């Protein structure tokens, strides 16, 4: 996106949870920085919008699905992120990662038995 829209994010939640939901396990998580968290809150806390807030704050999209902002700190890391957004901050902070959460894990990091011992001293 070149310009932000709460509609696109509502359409995304629709895509993720339209008939796949269960009305009781629709925990979502949006991950972004602080400048994206701004765009989100500026448009979400309005009244013309359909979101309502539930004080750990959680949101409930007009779709009826439970949302949870997790503003991560690395989305603003000025080391790996270099390009600047005309509206301030690093453009990687204007970036949402919307993941369906529920109940076996969808993501896991693979490991091999005995990989913590591969330390050698050539002295």
């Amino acid at each position: 996106y070149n310009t932000f829209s709460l509609k696109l994010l509502e359409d995304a939640l629709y895509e993720l949870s339209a008939s796949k939901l269960a009305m009781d396990d629709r925990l979502f998580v949006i991950k972004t920085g602080e400048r994206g968290a701004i765009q989100f809150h500026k448009e979400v806390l309005k009244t013309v919008s359909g979101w309502t807030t539930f004080v750990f704050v959680e949101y409930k999209a007009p779709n009826g699905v439970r949302v949870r902002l997790d503003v991560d700190p690395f989305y603003d890391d000025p080391v790996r992120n270099k390009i600047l957004h005309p509206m301030g901050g690093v453009a990687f902070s204007y970036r949402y990662d919307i993941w369906y959460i529920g109940t076996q894990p969808n993501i896991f990091k693979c490991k091999i038995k005995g990989d913590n011992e591969y330390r050698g001293y050539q002295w």
Binding site: D76, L84, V90
Partner: protein, 333 residues
């Protein structure tokens, strides 16, 4: 200017090139020395305390040897040109607060990567034109960044009048609109600055920036008014301070590693690099392999500095001597 080393770096100053060891009289005098068979190469340099000889270079173990022109080590000072875009409006719109932001990538005294801002406020009224806007925005920037209170600004502000188009009109925390009497101001330029340098404590370093413009309402639409284009630099920062630090650090590899630590009980080293002069550098990377069972390489490098006078005369002669002695084919500048 602590650096990374391939196990060592040594620096010798070629303040003067002499033909024989007997002519080494002043400190800095140097002569490249190699046998007739061209098996080893070494340098005899006059230190303040007698002539010292460099490490011996087995001319079969030379990995690379290239020289620099002293223009590669210079840092051009970045400067943008700020201007309000004729798309939003070719002239300021009344009632709107124009707030300019300077996005610095480090703080003033630190080198860690962070986001650091400085701002400039201007509130436009019914009659304010472009010239008056640039004027008041520049003065606001100066009073907000030139609040140094000790040393010097973080960037320098100038104005260009359409008549000059090339004469940067400086703006400082003391300037006031009475001093700026033109009516054809068409842009604002913001150059980088040479920050404080100390010989072995504060390395030469810069803090880049980006002019960011906040949003104004023009026709009910929040919009960006500015154009932060990058005009070509006109000022430069030579390597004298950069080279002097190289010497300060690389003289602890043959000299005293402590330098002021036990301050009363110290050894003080005399340095021959003149911070303020421009040096063109030469470097020779070589290694020592060893005997049976001892194939591991001990790679090394010997670098040599020489003042540039436009044409890289001094270094060109020094390498010509080194090619005549060691038969190498180092290229001239």
């Amino acid at each position: 200017m602590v650096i990374s080393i391939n196990q060592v770096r040594q620096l010798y100053v070629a303040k003067a090139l002499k033909a024989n060891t007997a002519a080494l009289t002043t400190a800095g005098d140097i002569v490249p020395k190699a046998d007739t068979a061209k098996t080893t190469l070494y340098f005899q340099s006059m230190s303040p305390a007698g002539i010292v000889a460099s490490d011996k270079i087995n001319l079969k173990h030379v990995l690379y040897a290239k020289a620099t022109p002293s223009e590669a080590l210079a840092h051009k000072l970045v400067r943008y040109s700020v201007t309000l875009d004729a798309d939003v409006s070719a002239t300021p719109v009344a009632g709107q607060n124009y707030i300019l932001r300077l996005a610095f990538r480090q703080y003033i005294g630190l080198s860690e990567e962070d986001q650091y801002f400085k701002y400039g406020e201007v509130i436009a009224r019914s009659g304010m034109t472009a010239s008056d806007f640039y004027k008041k925005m520049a003065i606001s920037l100066a009073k907000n960044l030139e609040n140094k209170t000790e040393s010097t600004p973080l960037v320098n502000i100038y104005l260009i009048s359409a008549a000059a188009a090339s004469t940067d009109v400086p703006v400082t925390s003391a300037t006031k609109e009475s001093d700026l009497t033109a009516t054809d101001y068409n842009q604002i330029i913001i150059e980088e600055t040479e920050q404080p340098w100390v010989l072995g404590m504060m390395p030469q370093a810069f803090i880049p920036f980006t002019p960011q413009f906040l949003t104004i309402t023009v026709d009910g639409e929040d919009r960006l008014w500015g154009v932060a284009t990058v005009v070509t630099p006109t000022k430069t920062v030579p390597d004298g301070h950069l080279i002097a630090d190289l010497e300060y650090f690389c003289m602890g590899a043959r000299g005293d590693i402590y330098r002021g630590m036990g301050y009363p009980n110290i050894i003080k080293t005399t340095y021959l690099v003149d911070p303020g002069a421009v040096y063109d550098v030469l470097d020779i990377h070589y290694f020592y392999t060893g005997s049976n069972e001892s194939v591991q390489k001990s790679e090394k490098t010997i670098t040599l500095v020489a003042v540039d006078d436009g044409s890289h005369t001094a270094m060109n002669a020094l390498i010509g001597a080194i090619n005549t002695a060691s038969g190498l084919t180092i290229a001239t500048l």
